[PDB]
């Protein structure tokens, strides 16, 4: 039940169970799948560790939250510093999504991560800009609405369609778990390294996002505390890290 | 100069044909292979995956999370329908675009059982029962609780189970059934009624939502595979 | 019955039997 | 009981799709045709592929060239048969700058000629990938700056496709229209998606407009 | 002496003309559909319906034969013309113009063949949802017996469309497509007295009663 | 020389021949080919027995006459009630149809049993009505004539095509028997379930069509007595239905 | 000769060798 | 050289 | 690899080795 | 391979 990754130990329950990715657990890179030929390095504790997000308030009108995951460790420290100062890197994470309420509260929370998130634009002659995909300490939000029809380069963040031209209903593909107040308090979910190629650059490149998007709201009767927040916590898992040089963003 | 005569189909170019041919890469070394996760190996591995089904397809949720949630309430009555859908997984829009009705809209013939699990997202502190019914063609879709009974049904207490999944048999005169909407392959009504009024405490919550998920069982397979009508174009998108 | 002619994999038929 | 054969990926990808089609005449020196190679133009296959994020496979191309009389002021035209080329310039190569450039001779390159009236030239092609497997979204941007372009033509780099005719029939304009045809054989899936909701916008991005989530009812108890 | 030619396989696996439609050059409505059944023909109708049950896979043989339309223009060298032969099974989308995207047929199995070539062919399974082929059916669609009454209630084989591939040119073309069924590998059940009288419908045995047979004048007439 | 099914015992001859359809004995369905996953009901006793149906009377002029099967028990005990409450069914026949006269009687009715028996219309431009096809307990007639164009909705009853549009006199490739008042006083045809599927619903598919046409008319010189009655007997055999729900007819 | 050169066996020939 | 492909007598080549 | 095909020995190619 | 001419210039090339 603790868990304890690093220096940090998180608690869930025993009865709740941790959903592995797609079937695999985070390993390491082989010597018969890798191309860099520099020597890795892998801080080990230093980078494989609980950094415990931002917290965001679940309200009674929150449309959703997401995060694209390289960068929201991105200036976490030293899995940050490793990434400025390395040219490719690997990683898998496990994400524990803490909310927790009383019996009088309801909900129910969809918490899923999905690899390659590439998000489409209001303005169909332009891509989103970095800073509306992505916030790093600052997670982004959804919206209850389609957004204006000529915004200029923003996310077209209505809700039901998850900014990705689906149905938000067939997330479920994607490794997720389930939040529901009445019956959960955190959901945990390891994800493996999702790639194309065997590493990649992790500042241009966010190859997993997670997304929690409320599907029954928030609802609680007069007296019953009003404030519900979501504390998102995730941990690089078997990171490695090639091509040692000049640091920048 | 070995002898031979052309057959009929000669100089034909069949869109899904099977011959060699050859390649215009002689002995390009292709990239070696890499484990990545979450290997596919057939479309029904898809189909088996739950999906949050759409029932409240009311005209003011679809576009919105509200046609996901499915409304109970505390209310005064007794046997009082919660919903009912037919079972048109291909065809009728309860279904056709979850992710089993997708896949079945690249197919003509479809054939197997359904599980339609239900997950309770109300209080802690509330408490009932439900009567889930599939009834198959052949009479109306059930009127009351009572005719509901009669058919294939299962009484789910959210008093300790969250979630409930009732598991619609393969009912049919035919091995398979179209996924486009045929009255000889009709296939059933499945319908939701209160069984015990949701009993709530004080300053607890009286209305509550229900989240209903689709997926195909071990004995679920489709046929005649064939284009979908959800994609439609004009011109060469650029 | 069913053999290759040609030398490199990419000219096979598809990986259905 | 019951087999799921017909379900595999294989069978469901490997089918022959038009993935696009051009036109090219033979009068003027911009008589011949152009095409840089991607899999977005067209909503089926996209739409085939992009249930998957990462996709592997051969392909079987398989080319359908049509041809037509145009308008002539002529006495009278009598156009012999018509032998067309279809040259692949991988990214850098040289490229045809006129119907008659040098480009044409691909001593390297490889390219098709084909005569019409006889099977459709057809052609098999390995896994063309730099990386281990194709990629069918991209959640990053082309530049390490985290700007300039966003999306899957960060990646798309798979080279042009050029047409032209070999004869000169100069008698009577004649306007001929090749269209490609995509087969993805030995076939290796990664990682489903949700299907395409919502129609495609555009041939390199995801933008989308949004739609409702499926088609509607009156009430909950509608059947 | 054998009866090996008169075996069920030797009976009906010999190729039959089903049905022929016309496409021409002209126009964006240039395009030709054909919903599937076997009703249609007199003669390979009668030959299966014979029998109440059959099943057996299909060799389809395409015959497709074009003819130069008048036109007004000077000198009609029209080049060599290519037809896309497109299969919709039932639900799938439907070709509403010759320029169509349905024509990209990236699931949807066709043919493309260009004329002056060996008739395209191509085989087919047995593609029933039930474990026979019907040959008739004494019920109705609705379970309220009511709406339809016969074997067109079962008859759901898909959509079949035709076109020209070439871009058209100064001169009209009109083309005559002809399908020919060849059943192969057959099984069939429970024979049933030939057809008498005439066929009327398609979807429904409607007959106009006719005598039992040829008449002489006596019962002794040589 | 008696069969008895049930609470039911017909007496028939001295090792007369019953024509046992073709060459099959009646056979509950087996697991291989079925598709239906619902375990089937099996009534035995109370379903699978005589049931006697209306009496008809052969007449000098009379056409002949047809029952579709399904139909035709449809009204008549646990049978019916059993086809109302099941979605799908499976049965075979034991059909007994009993006429005696004397040896100063003559006539000859064909019996026979037509699988699919799908019938024509008197307007070429329409299906025959429910009503016109169907007469459960209430034998429907052939006609001594042709129907009338202008009838719209109503079967073709021409005997001598039978209402299929074939010739009467070829009807002998179903299984059937002759009534030869001369030297016989019943006929009995022990049918199998006729279907291209394993099972079907028994409202809107009557698989066979029992059929009595008397080809030599009914004769009797004067004193003989002159009502001459045909009393058809069916009993279910094998009866099996799946998919319990409310009934309708 | 009875070599089948397809996978599928509807593209087999007819059933007429005895 | 003689292996007949077709499956009746007639589709023979001459006897020689 | 030489085959004949036919039955007449003056169908067959030159005798070149 | 099964090579169909006497003479080693008609042979395909030397891959593999």
Redesign the interface.
């Known amino acids: 039940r603790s868990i304890t990754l690093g220096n940090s130990t998180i608690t869930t329950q025993e009865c709740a169970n941790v959903v592995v990715?797609?079937?695999?657990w985070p390993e390491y890179l082989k010597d018969?799948?890798a191309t860099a030929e520099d020597q890795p390095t892998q801080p080990d504790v230093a980078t494989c560790r609980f950094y415990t997000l931002e917290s965001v308030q679940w309200m009674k009108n929150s449309?959703g939250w997401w995060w694209?995951l390289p960068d929201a460790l991105s200036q976490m420290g030293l899995f940050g510093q490793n990434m400025q100062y390395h040219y490719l890197g690997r990683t898998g994470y496990t994400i524990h999504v803490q909310c927790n309420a009383?019996?009088?509260?309801?909900?129910?929370l969809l918490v899923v991560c999905?690899?390659?998130?590439?998000?489409?634009?209001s303005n169909?002659?332009?891509?989103?800009e970095?800073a509306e995909?992505?916030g790093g300490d600052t997670a982004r939000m959804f919206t209850?609405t389609?957004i204006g029809e000529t915004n200029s380069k923003k996310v077209?963040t209505?809700?039901?369609?998850?900014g990705?031209?689906?149905?938000?209903?067939?997330?479920?593909?994607?490794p997720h778990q389930?939040i529901?107040?009445?019956?959960n308090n955190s959901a945990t979910i390891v994800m493996?390294?999702?790639?194309?190629?065997?590493m990649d650059?992790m500042?241009?490149?966010?190859?997993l996002?997670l997304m929690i998007?409320?599907?029954?709201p928030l609802?609680?009767?007069?007296?019953?505390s009003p404030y519900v927040p979501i504390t998102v916590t995730i941990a690089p898992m078997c990171a490695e890290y090639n091509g040692l040089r000049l640091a920048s963003? | 100069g070995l002898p031979v005569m052309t057959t009929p189909g000669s100089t034909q170019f069949l869109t899904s044909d099977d011959f060699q041919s050859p390649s215009a890469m002689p002995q390009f070394d292709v990239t070696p292979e890499m484990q990545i996760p979450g290997r596919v190996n057939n479309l029904m591995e898809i189909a088996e995956v739950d999906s949050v089904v759409p029932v409240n397809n009311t005209e003011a949720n679809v576009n919105s999370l509200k046609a996901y949630q499915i409304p109970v309430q505390s209310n005064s009555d007794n046997g009082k329908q919660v919903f009912g859908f037919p079972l048109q997984p291909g065809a009728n829009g309860v279904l056709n675009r979850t992710l089993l009705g997708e896949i079945l809209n690249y197919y003509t013939h479809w054939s197997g059982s359904i599980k339609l699990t239900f997950m309770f997202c109300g209080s802690a502190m509330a408490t009932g029962k439900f009567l889930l019914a599939y009834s198959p063609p052949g009479a109306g879709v059930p009127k009351n609780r009572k005719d509901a009974m009669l058919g294939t049904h299962v009484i789910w207490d959210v008093g300790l189970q969250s979630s409930c999944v009732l598991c619609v048999p393969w009912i049919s005169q035919t091995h398979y059934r179209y996924v486009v909407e045929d009255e000889y392959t009709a296939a059933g009504y499945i319908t939701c009624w209160y069984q015990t009024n949701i009993v709530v405490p004080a300053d607890v919550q009286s209305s509550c939502d229900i989240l209903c998920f689709v997926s195909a069982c071990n004995d679920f397979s489709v046929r005649m595979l064939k284009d979908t009508p959800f994609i439609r174009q004009d011109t060469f998108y650029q | 019955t069913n053999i290759n002619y040609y030398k490199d994999a990419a000219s096979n038929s598809a990986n259905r039997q | 009981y019951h087999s799921r054969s017909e379900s595999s990926i294989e069978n469901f990808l490997c089918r022959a799709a038009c993935v696009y089609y051009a036109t090219y005449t033979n009068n003027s020196e911009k008589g011949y045709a152009e095409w840089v190679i991607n899999t977005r133009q067209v909503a089926q296959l996209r739409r085939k592929l992009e249930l998957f994020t990462y996709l592997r496979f051969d392909l079987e191309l398989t080319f359908v060239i049509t041809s037509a009389q145009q308008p002539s002021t002529a006495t009278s035209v009598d156009a012999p048969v018509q032998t067309h080329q279809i040259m692949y310039v991988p990214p850098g190569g040289p490229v045809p700058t006129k119907v008659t450039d040098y480009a044409w001779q691909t001593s390297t390159n490889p390219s098709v000629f084909w005569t019409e009236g006889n099977a459709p030239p057809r052609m098999s092609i390995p896994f063309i990938s730099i990386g281990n497997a194709y990629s069918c979204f991209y959640d990053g941007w082309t530049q390490f700056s985290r700007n300039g372009v966003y999306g899957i033509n960060t990646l798309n780099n798979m080279g042009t496709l050029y047409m032209r005719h070999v004869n000169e029939a100069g008698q009577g304009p004649i306007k001929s229209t090749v269209r490609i045809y995509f087969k993805p054989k030995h076939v290796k899936a990664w990682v489903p998606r949700p299907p395409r909701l919502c129609q495609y916008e555009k041939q390199k991005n995801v933008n989308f407009t949004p739609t409702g989530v499926t088609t509607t009812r009156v009430g909950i108890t509608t059947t």
């Not at chain 1, 169909?124 to 989103?128: D, E, R």
């Not at chain 1, 990705?164 to 994607?174: A, C, F, Q, R, S």
């Not at chain 1, 493996?192 to 065997?198: D, E, L």
């Open positions: 990715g797609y079937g695999v018969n799948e449309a694209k009383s019996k009088f509260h309801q909900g129910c999905v690899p390659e998130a590439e998000m489409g634009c169909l002659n332009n891509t989103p970095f995909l992505s209850d389609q077209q209505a809700v039901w369609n998850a990705m031209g689906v149905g938000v209903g067939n997330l479920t593909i994607y389930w529901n107040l009445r019956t493996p390294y999702i790639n194309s190629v065997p650059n500042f241009r490149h966010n190859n996002t998007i409320p599907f029954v609802n609680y009767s007069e007296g019953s963003s």
